[PDB]
Amino acid sequence: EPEWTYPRLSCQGSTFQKALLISPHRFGEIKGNSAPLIIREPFVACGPKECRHFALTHYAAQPGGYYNGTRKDRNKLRHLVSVKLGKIPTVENSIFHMAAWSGSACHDGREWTYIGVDGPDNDALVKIKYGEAYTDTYHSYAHNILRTQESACNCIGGDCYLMITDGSASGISKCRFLKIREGRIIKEILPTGRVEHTEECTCGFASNKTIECACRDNSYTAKRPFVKLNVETDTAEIRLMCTKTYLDTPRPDDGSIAGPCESNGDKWLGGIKGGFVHQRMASKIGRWYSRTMSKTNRMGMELYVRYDGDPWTDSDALTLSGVMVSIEEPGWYSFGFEIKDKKCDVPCIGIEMVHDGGKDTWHSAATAIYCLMGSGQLLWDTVTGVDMAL
Amino acid sequence: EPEWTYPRLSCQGSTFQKALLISPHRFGEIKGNSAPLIIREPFVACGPKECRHFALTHYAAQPGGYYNGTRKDRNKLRHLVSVKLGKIPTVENSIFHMAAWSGSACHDGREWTYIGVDGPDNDALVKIKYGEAYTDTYHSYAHNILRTQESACNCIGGDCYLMITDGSASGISKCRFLKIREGRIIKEILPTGRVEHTEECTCGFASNKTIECACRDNSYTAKRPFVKLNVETDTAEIRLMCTKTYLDTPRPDDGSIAGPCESNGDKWLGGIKGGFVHQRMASKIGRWYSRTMSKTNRMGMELYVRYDGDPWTDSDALTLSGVMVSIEEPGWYSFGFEIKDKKCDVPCIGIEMVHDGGKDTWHSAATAIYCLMGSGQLLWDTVTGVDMAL
Amino acid sequence: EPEWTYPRLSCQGSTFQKALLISPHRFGEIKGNSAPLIIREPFVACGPKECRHFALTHYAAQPGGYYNGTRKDRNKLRHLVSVKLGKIPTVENSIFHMAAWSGSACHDGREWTYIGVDGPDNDALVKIKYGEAYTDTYHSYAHNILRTQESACNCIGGDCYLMITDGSASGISKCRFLKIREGRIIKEILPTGRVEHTEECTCGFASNKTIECACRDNSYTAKRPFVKLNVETDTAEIRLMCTKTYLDTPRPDDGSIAGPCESNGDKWLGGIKGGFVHQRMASKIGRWYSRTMSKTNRMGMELYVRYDGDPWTDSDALTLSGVMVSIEEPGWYSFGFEIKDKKCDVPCIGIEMVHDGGKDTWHSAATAIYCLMGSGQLLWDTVTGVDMAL
Amino acid sequence: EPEWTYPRLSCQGSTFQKALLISPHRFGEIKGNSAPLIIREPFVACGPKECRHFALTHYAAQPGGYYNGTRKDRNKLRHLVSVKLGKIPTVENSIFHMAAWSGSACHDGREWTYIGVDGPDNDALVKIKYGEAYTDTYHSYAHNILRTQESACNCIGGDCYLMITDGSASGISKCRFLKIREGRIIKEILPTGRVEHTEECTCGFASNKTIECACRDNSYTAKRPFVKLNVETDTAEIRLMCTKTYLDTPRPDDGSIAGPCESNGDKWLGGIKGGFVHQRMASKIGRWYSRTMSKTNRMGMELYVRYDGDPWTDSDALTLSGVMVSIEEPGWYSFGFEIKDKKCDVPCIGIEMVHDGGKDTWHSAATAIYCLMGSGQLLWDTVTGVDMAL
Ligand SMILES: CCC(CC)Nc1cc(C(=O)O)ccc1N1C(=O)CCC1(CO)CO
Ligand SMILES: CCC(CC)Nc1cc(C(=O)O)ccc1N1C(=O)CCC1(CO)CO
Ligand SMILES: CCC(CC)Nc1cc(C(=O)O)ccc1N1C(=O)CCC1(CO)CO
Ligand SMILES: CCC(CC)Nc1cc(C(=O)O)ccc1N1C(=O)CCC1(CO)CO
Ligand SMILES: [Ca+2]
Ligand SMILES: [Ca+2]
Ligand SMILES: [Ca+2]
Ligand SMILES: [Ca+2]
Ligand SMILES: [Ca+2]
Ligand SMILES: [Ca+2]
Ligand SMILES: [Ca+2]
Ligand SMILES: [Ca+2]
């Protein structure tokens, strides 16, 4: 019985640096001989012995003949696949875990838990897979696209928590939390506080007692709903992030939202999933966030940090920490994950870099990686080097 | 000595849902760079640690230059191959186990048993392989295409049973059962009861004492010969399925076969292999069957269930349980298999979706998967997304 | 310390049957997307847990641009490669072990021993590799193409024996035997008896004390030099095969060589490597041989058996045992090997089927497999299904 | 806790022989179906159970559409990748470890340590990765292209040493040494003696106490700076090689540098990384070096040996030991590494054979291998067999 995974102390360090870049389409030339899968919503989750790179493929490759439709986000073809982090995710290299147009996964220290969501928009369903066996499901409660995180779920002592949501993109979307153990939902948690619209939550362990999430409100505020979840009482409350450094996109100039922490401000219809990871020290807590550069578009991506404090009531702007991607490169979904070293955990931030070339061609994405290593300051940015005409 | 496999209690659940789809030809475009094998008669078998996807390749790929002949079912080129369930079965990814134009396989908890059938139609022969070593054979007794199940054989406490048949497709085809242990036939069983024509049996454990099979009669009835095999006395009897929900194809309207359970009705020359799996509860028994939608063609596929009762003498129609495939998609051979979770077994139903485009092109198939997970009702159907012009 | 390999009793059986066929060029169409290596002199060797398929690649693939030269047998590019038996030997799937234009290998029960031969014709050299480390060599003693078996070397209790030869193809070629242990030559054996010309020896264990070989004399007789090697006294003697069923090619009509066992007869310049394997019973000894059909060309291949007796002095023709390949298909080098089952050994015969299309195109080969399984008679032959115009 | 790696006694032997050649571009024809990565600066490092082949890919393949730029040595795309020695390094077969335009790696007996260098020329940074986790960094001290060895770092009892350098290529480049343990720099060593310009050091264990390196001075002498590093006192001193057999390239005729050991002679602006490995005997020490044939260009490569003596003060020319590559083939970077046999170490010499075809096409390299095996003399040379027009 390989003991259960538990959050540890982060490894010593004080800055992020360019780590690894998976640009599969650097090999999809019409004149090349490779078959890189067409995907989106990628993310990484790590176990005690290995890190896996997950994504939602449109079940097609480049070069191929099924580019039309790769732009849509839901259909009966999309599948959750994954490869060892470091391997190019190609047709042959990939493992198709289950059909889904929305997913997540995490390793409890013994086995992998794979979460996938598919079905009709009005009654979609969450499927849970533990290793090889399909073991449970969950139904749409708001009957409007049951969806999940698009990032690693979190496990502790055997219990894994996962945020799911149901509702209109431009309306009410009260999220919920699932407490999964060995593949089956053993509890349903209903969040408290600001619950109007919450989704695509990037969660992580702030400690052995609390799991925190930075999320996405898609129709009311440029501020990010921030979840705090007590693992001991299994209760969860939500409140908007008080910092003037709005992490969502689009958004207005920093600090331009008048009023107290809780004020939503202009709707700024839409948003984006943002990265977020913890830096657990003995008596301090680093909270790293990522956010696109352009205030209105998905271009560039910068790193931000803020040690200690209550994100719920601290308006002091975040400390800029570096340019992971320039505004000349695409910066879409970002997520956080943690690599497990011999005696400590290593926080990282992934960055989906979408190759959007329009509706009349393929639509895929690279994945850029930045982790905590050493001191000083972020030294280098990331590019995809991909030309969509090849 | 990794203990022997034994049938367990099915995992809690009350409905089937779209699980996984392996559509290898979504990657065989003339403009792509993949090499998906051309196959047919696919099926899945699982061991304690992994599930493998088997099939009969025509030893050619798409795109290739050997499409002519992929339509025929027997020749000196066909081979039994397999890959980990989840991997696209391609030239590089596949393992060729042995030459055969008819096969089956199962895992006894220690090693894999591979069964293949090849040779001349008038004197074909069954080859048994245990892991790496070829260990035994069996000769044609009716000298007319010795053939096997095309689905997982079943093992218990070390002994594996397998149905084989010999005879005319439109005549007598008395099937037999082989009791294999560690690679060698240790017993031959002769069925009792209705034995005129029985084949392509989909078998599974109804319990530790009985192995049941839903089979195919190809020249007399649209009803399905149903086998019951006692593992303790090693005797087996056959009788036709009494339900008015005829599972074969072609077939007439349900309940239209006048007379008692045993009446054959019109010949309805031909048939098809059908899916069938068990749902073992503490004091109840679920029996799941699949059958094409069109009464005369291989289009669409619906799921059916029926708890308890004696299929041999119960005429009450089956309970429709969902549309796994629409009549607009192809639905050919279906089979059943079971995934092994930590403490219980998970029943599933595979569906070969053949890409028939005529005699002047390639002929291959995808494999759609549906397993028992959660409650409610089957929510979504499966498509292949493959265009045979690419 | 995983105990050393020792010859065991063959598994029960009384006939050979078509087992497996590796036709890599069924995937090398100019219109396909595969990269099967161009090779020759293939063979199989098995360990306790797996069988590997070895060959000498010309370091090129089909389709490619380096076909010119694939016809020559020696150069600075040829390499010894291998894959798990069952996997198509392609660029990606293969493992290049060492450069060589002549080779062999065997598993002592702990590690693999790889033998390769390269260098100039006048001073070639034998390289020995044990697992990952290169550990020893052997120099040309007759300074005229030091060459080896082209088939599995044989190991026992830790000591592996290997036949090597040096000399003119149409002249003297006194072979020698190397006794290798853990990668290093611990002894050199000089054969006794008829030693004029001996090579490409197919060796195997007739028992724990004797290793026997059927070989190739290339310039004097159509008869096959037969080696007997005592493992206890580490001495070896050679004498020509006395049977009237000449195994070499070319050769004259059977029994047409007048005189006693030892008479050479007409030169019949040239020859071919032939298959040969043992069937060890409790008190009997089966000796299986293969030989092409055409008396003058490499077309077709039939199986022959002969239980007990002394091949050195028995002129009774061999018992025809079946047509493994028809005279319409190519039949080149054949070899023997043994698969290791749980409690007994399973003898097999490999058949290199060369796709010779001339000097102005590629030149590669498939590998056909036949093993001992069941009773009755060899039922089916093997074809390559490959068209050299694609 | 798999014990730590320690230098052992070399395996018995007295000469080098052609071992293995990895020519990935023998498969990159425009008409082939393979995808071999475009790389440079390859090298090998071995652990107790396996040897890995590392290199710096330009994140492109042949055939591809990203050839422009493959000539430059630094950019945000270059990555450190590796495959099991014996496998062709292709898109699918390779593992991308981390982004870098300069690297090294070594196995401490438990885990792999990967070193990579990227960032801006004026402030580049060294990243250390231990297995899966990124664990430490090191900053540029001379702010001018922080670079590393391009060959296996060396570990002992758990502590790994690595040479790094910072400075102008045609000026001062005082190198430094890092003492890494379990992924983190636990010490910084400043060399003593001739420290004007030292880089691309090829290091190895001369004994349990000393690690020696043959390096590259790029702007002052054709002589090779030779490092001696005491592992017990963790101090290191440098002095130029005194032999008249200048190992650098370009260089003047041997022995033409007038003066004592320390004299630099004409600048001979430029240089090259050279191979160097040890042959540890009980009471003798073999030191093997490689150097291109042409005195001014990177063509051909010969092996040299010299037992015992102090390279710092011995002017006796080295003993020519063979032609590994002819002056008609390209001979670029050469390095040394050691394979670990059951009870002794086996020294080898790698040779990067660059396919330079100009600035208007691709630029990649094969890797030729020669190891210590047997006695006599190096018998055969190596060719790439690659035609850059295909
Ligand atoms: C409808 C809700 C919306 C977020 C506010 N979801 C969403 C947004 C984008 C995007 O803004 O680019 C891309 C994909 C999705 N997804 C879907 O449409 C199904 C679930 C998934 C997965 O693809 C992630 O939420
Ligand atoms: C001749 C008997 C008939 C079933 C009544 N078999 C059969 C039917 C079909 C089909 O109806 O599409 C496809 C393949 C076969 N098979 C053969 O011809 C050889 C054995 C195998 C395997 O391919 C399965 O029975
Ligand atoms: C010169 C001796 C001759 C056998 C009598 N060898 C030989 C014959 C053939 C053939 O007759 O088709 C093919 C290859 C070889 N080989 C060589 O030329 C080098 C060694 C090897 C390996 O290829 C096997 O002996
Ligand atoms: C600028 C210093 C110079 C050596 C004197 N480096 C160097 C030389 C060559 C070559 O002479 O062909 C190729 C690559 C490099 N490298 C770089 O430019 C970055 C580091 C690396 C790796 O590619 C190795 O030193
Ligand atoms: Ca592949
Ligand atoms: Ca928003
Ligand atoms: Ca491949
Ligand atoms: Ca019927
Ligand atoms: Ca591949
Ligand atoms: Ca002859
Ligand atoms: Ca591949
Ligand atoms: Ca120099």
Which domains can be identified in chain D, with CATH numbers?
1-390 (2.120.10.10)
| Facing D91 at nearest CB: one of A34, A371, A373 | A34
Report the distance separating Cα A90 and Cα A23, nearest Å: 11
Burial C73-83 (b: 16+ CB within 10 A, else e): ebebbbbbbbb
State whether D19 and C134 contact (CB < 8 Å).
yes
Ligand 4 cavity residues, CB under 6 Å? D 41, 56, 73-74, 101-102, 145, 147, 150, 169, 199-200, 218
What is the distance between the alpha carbons of residues D194 and D150, in angstroms, rounded to a whole number?
22
Cα–Cα distance for residue pair C33/A92, rounded to 1 Å: 13
Length of chain C: 390
Across the interface, of C19, C376, C387, the residue whose CB is closest to B98 is: C19
Calpha distance B99→C369 (Å, rounded): 10
Cα separation, C177 vs C175, whole angstroms = 7
Please answer whether residues C316 and C243 qualify as being in contact, where contact means their C-beta atoms are separated by less than 8 angstroms. Answer: yes
Q: Is residue D323 within 8 Å of D302, Cβ to Cβ?
A: yes
Q: Binding residue per annotation — C199?
A: yes
- Give the residue carrying structure tokens 């003898």: C347
- Contacts C146 to D, Cβ<8 Å: none
| CB contact (8 A) between residue A379 and residue D123 | yes
Whole-number Å distance between alpha carbons of B8 and B46: 14
User: Rounded distance, CA D335 to CA A356, Å?
Assistant: 43
CA B236–ligand 2 middle distance (angstroms):
23
Which residues of B are catalytic, by number?
73, 333
Cα of D30 to nearest chain C Cα, Å = 8
Distance, CA of D186 to CA of D181 (rounded, Å): 7
What residues of chain D, 311 to 370, have a C-beta less than 8 Å from chain C?
Answer: 339-342, 346, 348
C-alpha to C-alpha distance for C299 and D272, rounded to whole angstroms: 55
Closest approach of B50 to chain A, Cα-based (Å): 7
Mutate to test the interface with D, among A51, A379, A381 (most CBs of D within 10 A): A379
The answer to whether B40 and B59 have CB atoms below 8 angstroms apart is no
Q: Within 10 Å of residue A229's Cβ, how many Cβ atoms?
A: 26
| Ligand nearest to the Cα of A251, by number | 6
Q: A336 with A151: CB under 8 angstroms? A: yes
Instruction: Copy the structure tokens of residue C17.
Output: 């049957």
What is the rounded CA–CA span in Å between residue C249 and residue C270?
7
| Residue of C114, C130, C333, C370 marked active site | C333
d(CA D302, CA D293): 6
Q: Which residues surround ligand 11, an ion (CB under 5 A)?
A: A 92; D 92
Catalytic residue among C66, C73, C136, C254: C73
Pocket residues: Cβ below 6 A from ligand 1? A 41, 56, 73-74, 101-102, 145, 147, 150, 169, 199-200, 218
Give me the residues paired with residue B210 across strands. B230
Return the number of other C-beta atoms located less than 10 Å from residue C111's C-beta: 17
The end-to-end CA distance of chain A, in Å, is: 50
Find, among D344, D288, D338, the residue nearest to D51 by Cα: D338
The atom number, within ligand 4, closest to the CA of D270 reads 5
For ligand 2, is residue B365 a contact (CB within 6 Å)? Answer: no
Tracing tokens 């018992």 back to the chain, one arrives at C319
CA distance C239 to C262: 7
Residues 119-138 of B with CB under 8 A from C: 119-120, 123-125, 127-128, 130-138
In chain D, which residues have their Cβ closer than 8 Å to the Cβ of C138?
Answer: 374
Query: Ligand 4 test: best mutation among D147, D249, D355, most atoms within 8 Å of CB?
Result: D147
Mutating to test ligand 4, I would choose from D54, D56, D73, D165 the residue with most ligand atoms within 8 A of its C-beta, which is D73
Give the C-alpha separation, A372 to D134, whole Å.
7
Residue with tokens 């069925």: B191
Of residues C346, C326, C293, the one with CA closest to residue C16 = C346
d(CA C88, CA C39): 12
CA distance A261 to chain B (A): 41
User: Given an 8 Å threshold on Cβ–Cβ distance, is B99 in contact with C18?
Assistant: yes
Over its C-alpha atoms, chain A yields an Rg (Å, rounded) of 19
Q: A80 forms bridges with which residues in the sheet?
A: A56, A98
Q: Is C118 annotated as a binding residue?
A: no
Interface of A with D in 1-40 (CB under 8 A): 11, 17-23, 26-27, 29, 31-34
C-alpha C214/C-alpha C200 separation (Å) is 9
3-state secondary structure at position D54: strand
**How close, in Å, is residue B303 to chain C by CA atoms?**
36
- B50 lies within 8 A of chain A by CB: yes
Contacts of B18 in chain A (CB under 8 A): 76, 99, 118-119
**How far, in Å, CA of A156 to CA of A338, rounded?**
14
Of the listed ligands, the closest to the CA of B39 is 2
- Cα–ligand 6 centroid distance for A291 (angstroms): 12
CA D279 to mean position of chain CA atoms: 17
User: What SS3 string covers chain A?
Assistant: CCCCCCCCCECCCCCEEEEEEECHHHCCCCCCCCCEECCCCCEEEECCCCEEEEEEECCCECCCCCCCCCCCCCCCCCEEEEEEECECCECCCCEEEEECCCEEEEECCCCEEEEEEECCCCCCEEEEEECCEEEEEEECCCCCCCEECCCCCEEECCEEEEEEECCCCCCCECEEEEEEECCEEEEEECCEECCCECEEEEEEECCCCEEEEEEECCCCCCCCEEEEEECCCCEEEEEECCCCCCCCCCCCCCCCCCCCCCCCCCCCCCCCCCCEEEEECCCCEEEEEEECCCCCCCEEEEEEEEECCCCCCCCCCCEEEEEEEEEEEECCCEEEEEEECCCCEEEEEEEEEEEECCCCCCEEEEEEEEEECCCCCCCCCCCCCCCCCC
Other Cβ atoms less than 10 A from the Cβ of D85: the count is 23
| Number of the ligand closest to the Cα of B165 | 2
Ramachandran quadrant class, D309 (left: phi over 0; alpha: psi -120 to 50; beta: rest): left
Cβ <8 Å between D92 and A381: no
Cβ–Cβ contacts within 10 Å for residue A343, how many? 9
- Asked whether C69 and C359 are in contact (CB, 8 A), the reply is no
Resolution in A: 2.3
**Does B291 contact chain C (CB < 8 Å)?**
no
Q: Is the peptide bond before B24 cis (omega within 30 degrees of 0)?
A: no
What's the CA gap between A173 and A150, in Å, rounded?
Answer: 16
Q: Is D17's CB within 8 Å of C130's CB?
A: no
Of all protein residues, the one whose alpha carbon is nearest to atom 15 of ligand 3 is C73
The β-bridge relationship of strands D235-240 and D192-193 is: parallel
What's the rounded Cα separation, in Å, for the pair D317 and C251? Answer: 60
Distance from CA of A153 to the nearest CA of B (A): 20
Q: Which of A31, A341, A381 sits opposite D64 (nearest CB)?
A: A31
Cβ neighbours around A310 below 10 Å, total: 11
Q: Note if C73 is an active site residue.
A: yes
Measured between beta carbons, which residues in chain D are less than 8 angstroms from residue A387? 65-66
For residue D251, how far is its CA from the centre of ligand 12 (angstroms)?
7
Minimal Cα distance from D17: which residue of C?
Answer: C127
- Which residues of chain A are within 8 Å of residue D66 when distances are taken between CB atoms? 26, 29, 385, 387, 390
